Each structure stands twice: as structure tokens, then as C-alpha cells.
Paper text:
Despite the requirements for aliphatic residues at a and d, up to 40% of these can be changed to other side chains without compromising barrel integrity. We introduced mutations at one or two of these sites to generate four groups of αHB: Group I had entirely hydrophobic interiors, but with different sizes and shapes of channel; Groups II and III had polar uncharged or polar charged residues, respectively, at specific points along the channel; and Group IV had aromatic residues installed in their channels. The twelve Group III peptides had positively and negatively charged side chains, Lys and Glu, incorporated either singly or paired at a and d sites; and a single peptide with Asp at d. Finally, one third of the designs were crystallized and yielded 12 X-ray crystal structures, all of which were open αHBs with fully accessible channels. Focusing on the small molecules, the αSA signal from the more-polar AAs and CHOs is dominated by the polar and charged Group II and III αHBs.
Residue numbers in the entry:
A (entry chain F), B (entry chain G), C (entry chain H), D (entry chain A), E (entry chain B), F (entry chain C), ...: 1 to 30
The structure:
């Protein structure tokens, strides 16, 4: 359904935020 | 539908937050 | 509809958060 | 309606978060 | 209604996050 | 109701995030 | 119900974010 | 159901954000 699919797009975008935060951790460790 | 479309706009805005965080990682690495 | 319009206001506010984070990246690069 | 009004209050609170992040950018630039 | 009231509690909590971020800006300016 | 109660748990968790950010402000001031 | 249970999982995940932020405060204080 | 499953995916993505923040704490402690 379209609402479930849109909520899954929100989850994917939150995962993109997590990936960006991991890049911040690696930048600080460097 | 309009609710699904609005939830997709929320997902797009969260992706914009992820892109900004990636720019923060690049700024710290520099 | 009013709920879709309110969800679009949430998306616009999240975009404002992304814009503020981009300003943080530019401040760090400077 | 009451649900739309409450979602608009969430959007206003997210805008307050964006404004605070802009203040963080100005603090880092200083 | 109870759902609208709970969404208003979420908005109040997000405002508390904005207030905490403002304290971070003041700490950096100091 | 159970949905309102779960949304109130989300609000309480967001308040925990605000409290943690206040601790970050105190750490930076120190 | 399944939606209430899923919203409670979101609250638990937000509490995990608060715990991680508390670890950031302790790292800065050190 | 599909909406509950999508909300559980949002919770999992928020847990990924918490894990990334824990990595930021470890980077700062180092």
C-alpha cells in the first residue's frame, strides 16, 4: 500500500542519516 | 494519495538532512 | 486536506533543519 | 481539526530546532 | 482528544530539544 | 487508549534526548 | 495491538539515541 | 500488517542512528 511504502521511504532516509553520522565518527577518528 | 505524497516529502526532507550531515563529515575531515 | 497540509509543514520544517546543518558545515570549513 | 493543529505544533517545534541549529552555526563561525 | 493531546506532548518535547540546542550555542559562544 | 499511550512514550523518549543535549551543553561549558 | 507495539519500538529506539548522546556528553567531560 | 512492519523499519533505522552516535562518543574519547 502507498502509506506503508511512504513510511518505508522515511525509514530509508533515516538510514541515510545514520550512514552520514558514521562518516562524522570516521572524520573525528582521523 | 495526498497523505502518501506528504509522507514522501518528509522522506525527501530527511534525505536533505543526511546530505547536510555528509557535508559536516567532509568539513571535519578538512 | 488539512492532515496532508500539516504533514507538508513538517516536511518544510525538516528542510529548514537541513539548511541550518549546511550552515554548520560552512562554519566548520571556515 | 485537532489532529491537524497538533501536527502544525510539531512543525513549529521543528522550526525552533532549525533556529537553534542556525545559532550553533553562528557560534562556530565566531 | 487523547491522540491530539499526545501529539501536543511530542511537540512540547521537540521544543525542549530546541531549548537544549540553544544552550549548546551559548556554551560554544562562551 | 494504546496508541495515545505509545505516542506519550515517544514524547518521554524525546524529553530524554533533550536532557542528554543539556548534558552536552554543560560538558562544552566545562 | 501491532501499531501501538511498533510505536513503542520507535520510543525504545529514541531512548537508545538519548543514551548515545549521554555517552557523547561523558566523552566531552573527559 | 504492512503499516506496523513499516513503523518497525523506522525503529530499526533510529537504532542505526543511535549506533552511529555511540561511534561518535568513542571517536571523541579517542
Amino acid at each position: 500500500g502507498e502509506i506503508a511504502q511512504a513510511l518505508k521511504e522515511i525509514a530509508k532516509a533515516l538510514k541515510e542519516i545514520a550512514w552520514a553520522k558514521k562518516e562524522i565518527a570516521q572524520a573525528l577518528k582521523g
